[PDB]
């Protein structure tokens, strides 16, 4: 049968829809800690860069996706998961922000599991 050529382009369209959902006001009560880079110095989190090698957040992910800086859905998903796994490394497991991260990550992973 005929060959195709647009797997990558449909993957990234799917990714923008997932990010749009993640940014939706419906999730704001638990998504807000992930909107913007952790302001390490302003917040006095002097140990953050001792624990976290590569900070990531959804505004940065949005900027990268809209600047075409992801090759495919795998690269987009890796940054999303990096931002969550940073949260889990830095904060205690019973911290309020970890519960918020796990809830938002359910939103992401549910949709990321689906075929585009």
């Amino acid at each position: 049968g005929p060959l195709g050529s647009s797997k990558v382009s449909e993957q990234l369209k799917c990714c923008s829809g997932i990010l749009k959902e993640m940014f939706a006001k419906k999730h704001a009560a638990y998504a807000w800690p992930f909107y913007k880079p952790v302001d390490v110095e302003a917040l006095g989190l002097h140990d953050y860069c001792d624990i976290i090698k590569h900070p990531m957040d959804m505004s940065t992910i949005k900027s990268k996706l809209e600047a075409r800086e992801y090759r495919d859905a795998q690269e987009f998903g890796a940054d999303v998961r990096l931002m969550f796994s940073n949260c889990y490394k830095y904060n205690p497991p019973d911290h309020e922000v970890v519960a918020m991260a796990r809830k938002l990550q359910d939103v992401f992973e549910m949709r990321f599991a689906k075929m585009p």
Partner: peptide, 17 residues
């Protein structure tokens, strides 16, 4: 949002909202 006063005061995240 973060309670910045308290986040700085204890060097761990404190949620304000």
């Amino acid at each position: 949002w973060y309670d910045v006063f308290l986040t700085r005061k204890y060097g761990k995240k404190k949620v304000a909202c």
